[PDB]
Amino acid sequence: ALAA
Amino acid sequence: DLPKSVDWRKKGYVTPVKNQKQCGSSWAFSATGALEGQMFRKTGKLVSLSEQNLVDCSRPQGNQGCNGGFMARAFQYVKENGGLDSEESYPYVAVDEICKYRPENSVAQDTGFTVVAPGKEKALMKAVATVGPISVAMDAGHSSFQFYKSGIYFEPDCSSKNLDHGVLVVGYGFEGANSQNSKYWLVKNSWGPEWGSNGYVKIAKDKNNHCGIATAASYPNV
Ligand SMILES: [Cl-]
């Protein structure tokens, strides 16, 4: 998942 | 039995926190973290490994660069490939590029990997206590995780089965005096030292496999  | 708490950062097994930026490569940061601790255990030297090497070259093992992947497919690649370069020789740029794997720049190897029985938090506790940092997948798709700052993270919306993010368990412990309650897994993330607690997060432990931490754990055999 990617950091917002 | 097993120790009441473990923290491999305190023994030199863990490199500083890195940042995957806008690339779906957490799987690679998790895989290099686990390989970094094992090579350290074996040689006494801590050397940052190349996530880029993994992103660019392991498509054959079933990884998809910045579009996702899995830690086990990455240990499988280091094994089929016979090696893995250092960060210093194959820098991270956060985009899918040409495989530039160079054997002369290899600083790690593995013969395969060991899996932790899925869903078994006590099997995981055992692997963390006796081996070193362990690669794990978790469910990180939550605002509370993006905004996490301190304390034990516990999010009701978390899933133990549908996971989307690879991380590294560097240890475990508890808060207070009773070693048996208020427990947590010590987890290294790859969103930079600025996210969370200096780049880490404490995830509720022995609370029904919270966020799926023990659903898919593995570590390389060096
Ligand atoms: Cl990712």
Indicate yes or no: CB of B146 within 8 angstroms of CB of A4.
Answer: yes
Q: Which of B9, B27, B32 is nearest to B170 (CA)?
A: B9
β-pair partners for B7: B171
β-pair partners for B34: none
Q: Which element (helix H / strand E) includes B43?
A: helix B26-43
Is residue B214 within 8 A of residue B118, CB to CB? The reply is yes
Indicate yes or no: CB of A3 within 8 angstroms of CB of B195.
Answer: yes
The interaxial angle of helices B26-43 and B71-81, nearest 10 deg, is: 50
Domain layout of chain B by residue ranges: 6-220
> What is the whole-number distance in angstroms between the Cα of residue A1 and the centre of ligand 1?
4
User: Cα Rg for chain A, rounded, in angstroms?
Assistant: 4
Indicate yes or no: CB of B20 within 8 angstroms of CB of A4.
Answer: no
| Three-state DSSP class for residue A1 | coil
Q: Which of B144, B119, B123, B137 is nearest to B196 (CA)?
A: B144
For residue B10, what are its two tokens? 């305190």
For the segment(s) B6-220, the CATH number from 3.90.70.10, 3.40.50.2300, 3.30.70.20, 3.40.50.300 is 3.90.70.10
Cα angle B85, B166, B23; round to 5: 70
| Three-state DSSP class for residue B185 | strand
Cα angle B146, B151, B156; round to 5: 60
Is residue B71 within 8 A of residue B51, CB to CB? The reply is no
Sign of the torsion angle spanned by Cα atoms A4, B70, B65, B82:
positive
Neighbours of ion ligand 1 (CB under 5 A): B 24, 26
Which residue of A lies nearest to B141 if distances are taken between CA atoms? A1
What is the spatial distance between Cα B141 and Cα B163, in angstroms, rounded to a whole number?
9
Query: In this structure, which amino acid lies at residue B118?
Result: P
Indicate yes or no: CB of B22 within 8 angstroms of CB of A2.
Answer: yes
Query: What are the percentages of helix, strand and coil residues in chain A, rounded to 5?
Result: 0, 0, 100
Is residue B41 within 8 A of residue B13, CB to CB? The reply is yes
Q: Which element (helix H / strand E) includes B166?
A: strand B165-174
For residue B143, what are its two tokens? 């605002």
Is residue B38 within 8 A of residue B110, CB to CB? The reply is yes
B98: buried, middle or exposed (CB in 10 Å: 19+, 13-18, 0-12)? exposed
3-class SS string, B94-133: CCCCCCCCCHHHEEECCCCEEECCCCCHHHHHHHHHHCCC
Supply φ then ψ for residue B132, to 5 degrees. Answer: 140, -165
First to last CA, chain A: 9
Is residue B173 within 8 A of residue B6, CB to CB? The reply is yes
